[PDB]
Design a protein around this ligand. Structure first.
Ligand SMILES: OC[C@H]1O[C@@H](O[C@H]2[C@H](O)[C@@H](O)[C@H](O)O[C@@H]2CO)[C@H](O)[C@@H](O)[C@@H]1O
Ligand code: MG
Length: 431
């Protein structure tokens, strides 16, 4: 995409801490949340959930004729419901703006006006504070890393002149087809609008890359998940390479399931939640350690702090069926997937050393607040598949009727998440 000129681009200031020192950074809105309009005037190229067929009769013409516009100081709060102060960022769920209505948001941490901050998580400890108390069943306040290009794609794709400055270049391990711009081009070929989401559709291309999910959570359940891909960095995909939900799920270049460590699903029901050991009613510190052996990742450990207590990760709790692991390791992913009858796509795609090499090449930080039009977040907080009764089906305390976006959007429009005190530094020792 090229940049439009109707609205100046303002990145929202955010402080964080990098190896013992304060960094005055900022965040940027993902280009999918932006207005896409003619470079000539004000006409929408993307209008509702379909592209304009005059302006966009094929992707190349669409790319030439359309632009993504800026988000100025005022728009962050009143279109997106996003505020920041100091080292705290708050994302909103349903914000009814001027003439339109925004649902959730996704932002990236910037290094400067034109580049994302690049995190090299190997042999480091990454921490932050989150308040997930205002997120009911069916919502997900997520903090995670993805192998985006530092410049959002401008060096490699010459029709992307907007770049990281306009939040371009998102990819993740889902190989999402709902991205309006992929590899610098409008993804308008073969566009199908969503039946379910009036803002969304899917194009022929998907945008794949490695993804390290530090925190996927609402007030009811939480998980952290490593997703490795067999391709290197940001990778546009079509066809079977995308591994689309359904029959192709395991045939693409990325692991959609990931190797997930989700305490509730692993037989620890009161570890996290309302009045749990870690109490979602209140802010908590989430600390993640990327431990290496011979310079390669071999474990991802998790520690929590809340109210001055240090709380070790809860161990797998299937006595005599699975060892009490308490972290992501190769043996955990192998044994748990066997026990849960899950295809080990994580290993098929490179496993722990594939992930390590991904981490070594550097990742972009993402924070997001969303609901789930595909599976109602049931895989995080309920039972999934809904009628399944076998080990690993049970995920959280929520109803299998929870999480329909139409319901949660109407009933909990005020939902919010607050992330604060982002920090990276050497691996510390814990009591
Ligand atoms: O809970 C692990 C789980 O992944 C499920 O797919 C989730 C995925 O992990 C999440 O990242 C994505 O956005 O939503 C999907 C739903 O497709 C998968 O369906 C489960 O069977 C698997 O155990
Ligand atoms: Mg094929």
């Amino acid at each position: 995409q090229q940049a439009g000129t109707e609205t100046e681009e303002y990145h929202l200031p955010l402080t964080w801490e990098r190896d013992g020192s304060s960094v005055s950074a900022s965040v940027v809105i993902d280009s999918n949340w932006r207005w896409t309009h003619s470079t000539e005037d004000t006409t929408n190229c993307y209008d509702g959930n379909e592209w304009d067929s005059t302006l966009c009769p094929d992707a190349d013409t669409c790319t030439e004729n359309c632009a993504i516009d800026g988000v100025d100081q005022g728009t962050w709060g009143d279109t997106y419901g996003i505020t920041a102060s100091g080292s705290k960022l708050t994302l909103s769920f349903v914000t009814e703006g001027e003439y339109s209505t925004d649902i959730g948001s996704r932002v990236f941490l910037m290094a400067d006006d034109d580049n994302y901050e690049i995190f090299n998580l190997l042999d480091k400890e990454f921490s932050f504070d989150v308040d997930a108390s205002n997120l009911p069943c069916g919502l997900n306040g997520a903090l995670y890393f993805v192998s985006m290009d530092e410049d959002g794609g401008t060096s490699k794709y010459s029709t992307n002149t907007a770049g990281a400055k306009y939040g371009t270049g998102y990819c993740d391990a889902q190989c999402p087809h709902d991205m309006k711009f992929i590899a610098g081009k409008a993804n308008s070929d073969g566009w199908t609008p969503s039946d379910n989401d009036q803002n969304a559709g899917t194009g022929e291309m998907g945008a794949c890359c490695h993804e390290m999910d530090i925190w996927e959570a609402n007030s009811q359940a939480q998980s952290y998940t490593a997703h490795v891909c067999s391709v290197d960095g940001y990778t546009p995909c079509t066809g079977t390479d995308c591994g689309d939900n359904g029959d192709d799920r395991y045939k693409g270049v990325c692991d959609k399931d990931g190797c997930d460590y989700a305490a509730y699903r692993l037989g620890q029901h009161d570890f996290y939640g309302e009045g749990g050991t870690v109490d979602s009613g209140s802010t908590l510190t989430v600390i993640t350690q990327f431990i290496t052996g011979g310079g390669g990742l071999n474990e991802i450990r998790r520690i929590y702090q809340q109210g001055g207590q240090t709380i070790q990760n809860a161990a797998v709790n299937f006595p005599g069926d699975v060892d009490p692991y308490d972290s992501i390791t190769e043996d955990f992913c192998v044994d748990i997937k066997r026990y849960f009858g899950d295809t080990n796509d994580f290993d098929a795609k490179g496993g722990m050393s594939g992930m390590s090499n991904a981490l070594k090449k550097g990742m972009v930080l993402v924070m997001s607040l969303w609901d789930d039009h595909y599976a109602n977040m049931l895989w995080l907080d309920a039972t999934y598949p809904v009628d399944s009764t076998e080990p690993g089906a049970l995920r959280g305390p929520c109803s299998t009727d929870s999480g329909d976006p139409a319901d949660v959007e109407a009933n909990f429009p005020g939902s919010t998440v607050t992330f604060s005190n982002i920090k990276i530094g050497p691996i510390q020792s814990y009591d």
